[PDB]
Symmetry: D3
Subunit: 147 residues, 6 copies
Amino acid sequence: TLHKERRIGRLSVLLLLNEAEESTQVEELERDGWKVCLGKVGSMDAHKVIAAIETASKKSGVIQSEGYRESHALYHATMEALHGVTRGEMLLGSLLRTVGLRFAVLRGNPYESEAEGDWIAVSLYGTIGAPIKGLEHETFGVGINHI
Amino acid sequence: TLHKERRIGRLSVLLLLNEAEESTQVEELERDGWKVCLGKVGSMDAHKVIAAIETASKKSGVIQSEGYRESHALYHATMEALHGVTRGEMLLGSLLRTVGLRFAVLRGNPYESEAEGDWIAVSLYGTIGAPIKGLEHETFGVGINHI
Amino acid sequence: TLHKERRIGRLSVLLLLNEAEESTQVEELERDGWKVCLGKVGSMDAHKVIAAIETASKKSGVIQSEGYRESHALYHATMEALHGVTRGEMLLGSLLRTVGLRFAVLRGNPYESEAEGDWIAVSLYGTIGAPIKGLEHETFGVGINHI
Amino acid sequence: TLHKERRIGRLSVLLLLNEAEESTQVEELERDGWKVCLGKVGSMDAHKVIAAIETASKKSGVIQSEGYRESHALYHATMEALHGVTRGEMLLGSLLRTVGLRFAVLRGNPYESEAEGDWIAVSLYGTIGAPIKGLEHETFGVGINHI
Amino acid sequence: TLHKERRIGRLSVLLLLNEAEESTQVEELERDGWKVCLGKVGSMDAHKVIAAIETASKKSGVIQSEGYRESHALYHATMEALHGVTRGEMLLGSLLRTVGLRFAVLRGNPYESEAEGDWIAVSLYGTIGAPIKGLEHETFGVGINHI
Amino acid sequence: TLHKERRIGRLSVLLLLNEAEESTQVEELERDGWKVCLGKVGSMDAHKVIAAIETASKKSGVIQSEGYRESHALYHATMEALHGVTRGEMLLGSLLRTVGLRFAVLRGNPYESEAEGDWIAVSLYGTIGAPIKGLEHETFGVGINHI
RNA sequence: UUGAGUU
RNA sequence: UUGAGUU
RNA sequence: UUGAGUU
RNA sequence: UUGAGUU
RNA sequence: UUGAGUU
RNA sequence: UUGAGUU
Ligand SMILES: N[C@@H](Cc1c[nH]c[nH+]1)C(=O)O
Ligand SMILES: N[C@@H](Cc1c[nH]c[nH+]1)C(=O)O
Ligand SMILES: N[C@@H](Cc1c[nH]c[nH+]1)C(=O)O
Ligand SMILES: N[C@@H](Cc1c[nH]c[nH+]1)C(=O)O
Ligand SMILES: N[C@@H](Cc1c[nH]c[nH+]1)C(=O)O
Ligand SMILES: N[C@@H](Cc1c[nH]c[nH+]1)C(=O)O
Ligand SMILES: [Mg+2]
Ligand SMILES: [Mg+2]
Ligand SMILES: [Mg+2]
Ligand SMILES: [Mg+2]
Ligand SMILES: [Mg+2]
Ligand SMILES: [Mg+2]
């Protein structure tokens, strides 16, 4: 059962979709026990998007830098989020398109039961389009996994 | 070029994620010239999700009830939104999973140039999981198309 | 090397797109040594499309009715043709859409070298759309396989 | 309801699958109000195929060179046509295969009702195979979208 | 780093492919600390395959019957295994095909580092084909996930 | 009907999953009439995996070096095997992952009826992961086709 | 169309 | 890793 | 959950 | 073709 | 197998 | 954009 006040997906998205000069939403989430990471990446190569998210998550301490387990969890969460962004073919430059994204990675337990342990949510928001400024529209993606 | 104050995707998602009893965001969006539709649907059949969105959009006047053009635009926008929700296989019951969703459909011009005409965004948010209450996690999907 | 006068794909499509009452293209193709089958099928169930094509092919003698080999070749050729028709998700009714198709199955050697043996082409043409007459557009699909 | 004499998909394919030294089929379609573009492109990179179609369509006046709306419509129509060509994975060189294609882009209203506005069809025909002349078979793809 | 003597994938597959009446490989694996489950299921409905695997895994104690975490891990491992079996479209009956499978689910730590925790492997082996005995060929699938 | 003693899929996998210094399993299969090829390939480019399998199969005489028919059969069998390895997106480096594989290609008739002719099985086993030694897990894939 | 559900 | 780009 | 099936 | 690799 | 259909 | 190519 998901705890209404701990909906990791909704929280990650609301954080990513805000632009307040000083909302202190990060410190607030962290005070509540969440591990948070925010970043931005633009590219015509999906691997660069994946790497940016991984590197930011490890530097911010959202997931362990050592071992495979947590990296495995984050990779699959990122893949799931990329599905929403790419919608069918997980390709960018090869299909003549580019993305400009902001991302958020949140880690914690969104359930009422503490036995559910930690989960991770990767949320993406930005634009996708032809490699010409302006010829683009918005894109979103959210991936959730246990960790 | 997307107009900062008219980002259809971001606006549709923000509307979907708010539970304010008396927010009046719908009237505000409509005042700004947007055509808006909000609804909810849960099912183990993707076709029921698609139908709920189409029916709600036509009843609320977001898209024309007659003709094919606008229905065609809405169908593909819905398909794109479903990619984020299903992440790989656009199947629910056949893969032993069910979804409970809230949706928003927004229609208007998000660009600086009026020549870009109307576009439509279909946003979905809820939970996806096994057919047992509680064995689920959040899911999101956003599809954008010209109309 | 494909023989210019024996392009199985192009020939199957041309046969499918002609509505000439008394064309006699079938007899002409058969005179050239091709095994040909023409049919029609409409449905919201992909399996009914596959079955119609298989049954027609076996009844007309385009592929052997006994054994698995030729049925295996035809099944995969049909799957490839369905990709062009469905474009992403090989689903019809489950995604609230229906198809009305005409199909042609051609069998023979399209290469200059006789050692290439027989190949088979499955071509589909018709309309796909919402379950309401008129809310539809054209669809095409061609699958080619060795047999 | 599709107008029998204005079936954009069938017309685009019949144009592409003809090789008459002088059929004047282009001028005929244009006389009937259709905007037409014909071209050819070969590559192991899908983005080069997409770009060739876009550039030819804009140079021939089939779609507006300015703005995003029409480019958006053409991109998705091209993606749909590529599904028929690639059948599963929208990849060429990465999967050790190459394509040699001829393409046609047709724009106009294929419906009886003028309210349906303009639609666009992208049709592809050629060969796909290993990067060795002769080790190939035919391939086809048709994508249709509103514009 | 995977431990040579604890390769969960290889071990699960070897267990699945052995028909030795009195092999006692299950007891041996359990002696080594692995949690093991073996079963069989045939169907034209993918959801029945998923359900059989889940039910067998929970009854045999390979994964916890309560909570979502472990069920979530098993579901995704099963999905990955199904990719190898279905190869493109995770559909059986809808594409006029049926499967007869034997499955094995193994749980334990395959790495040298104990900090990697438990992982789970779902392996499938059997036949897939038309709904007519004999018109079929073999199929395999292996999915691995952290748990 | 598949012959119990000639299950091409199971045989190819058991061969690949063995590491005996001298099992003479190759000569045994060859004595039984099977054409066999064993190899290994690691890469972040799927095309290199495909090429390694093709080249080894042609050098070992498992398939004809001349003509297209047999190369066509092997290519599609390899594609099917890659589905089990990639599980969703047939991409490696582009999705920031690499594979280290051993492969086996077996050719012969696995059915009781000699009329079924030759079939081919491509089996893959190894590891897939991030481009960092140790951050990986096992992967498997089996593709079967008529030839 | 007005948020689904058990193997 | 500190929001991409022209066929 | 204890290996499916006809167009 | 004679088992890949760091963001 | 002899061209489908309403949320 | 004016039909690609070898492991
Ligand atoms: N509209 C495309 C992006 C794009 C490529 N070229 C133009 N637009 C998408 O939905 O991903
Ligand atoms: N976790 C699945 C849903 C599910 C099915 N069973 C359990 N959970 C998903 O990501 O869609
Ligand atoms: N336009 C859809 C079919 C459809 C469903 N609903 C309306 N139209 C397609 O391209 O397949
Ligand atoms: N036959 C492959 C193309 C190919 C690659 N290598 C040999 N042939 C296809 O259907 O796309
Ligand atoms: N050959 C198909 C199964 C099948 C359906 N009909 C005949 N055979 C596969 O590879 O899945
Ligand atoms: N775990 C991924 C591979 C990977 C990439 N990065 C880390 N691991 C898979 O299943 O393919
Ligand atoms: Mg993995
Ligand atoms: Mg459409
Ligand atoms: Mg098969
Ligand atoms: Mg788009
Ligand atoms: Mg999940
Ligand atoms: Mg082929």
